From a paper:
In this study we describe the crystal structure of the three carboxyl-terminal CCP modules of human FH (CCPs 18–20) at a resolution of 1.8 Å together with analysis of this region in solution by small angle X-ray scattering (SAXS). While the long axes of CCPs 19 and 20 are approximately aligned, with only a ∼32° tilt relative to one another, the long axis of CCP 18 is strongly tilted, by ∼122° with respect to the long axis of CCP 19, and by ∼151° with respect to CCP 20. The short (three-residue) linker between CCPs 19 and 20 (i.e. between the last cysteine of CCP 19 and the first of CCP 20) along with numerous inter-modular contacts imposes an approximately linear rod-like structure on this (GAG/C3b-binding) part of the molecule; the longer (six-residue) 18–19 linker permits a sharp kink to form in the molecule, also stabilized by inter-modular and module-to-linker interactions, but with a smaller inter-modular interface than observed between modules 19 and 20. Atomic distances consistent with hydrogen bond formation are observed between Gln1101 (CCP 18)-Gln1156 (CCP 19); Lys1103 (linker)-Asn1154 (CCP 19); and Lys1103 (linker)-Gln1156 (CCP 19). Furthermore, the surface area buried between CCPs 18 and 19 is only ∼400 Å, compared to almost ∼700 Å for CCPs 19 and 20. Interestingly, though, the experimentally derived scattering curves did not fit well to data back-calculated from the ‘J’-shaped crystal structure (discrepancy χ = 2.4); nor did ab initio low-resolution shape envelopes generated using the program DAMMIF demonstrate the same acute angle between CCPs 18 and 19. The SAXS data were fit well by an ensemble in which the 19–20 linker was fixed (χ = 1.3), but were fit poorly by the ensemble in which the 18–19 linker was fixed (χ = 2.4). Taking these data together, it appears that modules 19 and 20 are rigidly aligned such that their rod-like conformation is independent of the addition of CCP 18 or the presence of ligands.
Complement factor H (FH), a 155-kDa soluble glycoprotein abundant in human plasma, is an important regulator of the complement system, the chief molecular component of innate immunity. FH is a member of the regulators of complement activation (RCA) family that are characterized by possession of repeating compact domains, known as complement control protein modules (CCPs), sushi domains or short consensus repeats. Human FH binds to, and regulates levels of, the first activation-specific cleavage product of complement component C3, C3b. The four FH amino-terminal CCPs (1–4) perform co-factor and C3bBb decay-accelerating activities, while the two carboxyl-terminal CCPs also bind C3b but additionally bind to GAGs.
Author numbering: 1045 to 1230
The structure:
Amino acid sequence: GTSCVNPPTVQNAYIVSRQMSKYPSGERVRYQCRSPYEMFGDEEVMCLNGNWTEPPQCKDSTGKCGPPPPIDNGDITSFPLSVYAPASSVEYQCQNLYQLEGNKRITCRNGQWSEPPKCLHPCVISREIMENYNIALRWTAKQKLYSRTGESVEFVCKRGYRLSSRSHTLRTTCWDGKLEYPTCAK
């Protein structure tokens, strides 16, 4: 219960202590930054009862940033340079049906990018599940096969069924692929 695995990945650094698959509590992992990066924080990261202590960073001493980080199901809306001046910004776009969460723009400050956004998954609305659970969509308006993250999806029991005594509610919010279905019974 108190050993650790997977020492933190530190960009522009390598580990110079001996690597192993499981680190006992108390083991110290030592990082070194690649030239010409400057280290910030402690060069050693210890395993304390299953959690690592805080890792260092290896940054450009003039505050420049490297390429912006990739994000799942999204991409930047410009050519990715190898080097950005401090205060430069870039922006992201999510793929079709994905929902951007957080600021679409990131900025290079103090040698690191501000937090990029996420692209959250749409939810499948399964015909087969609905059939099996005796439910349908309340608004048969266009053929919505998917909901977007953040959208309410409302179902009804099919003609002649009522909500099963332990069912989820008939209205639920799609979130990052998660849709809770209700069930109805004769």
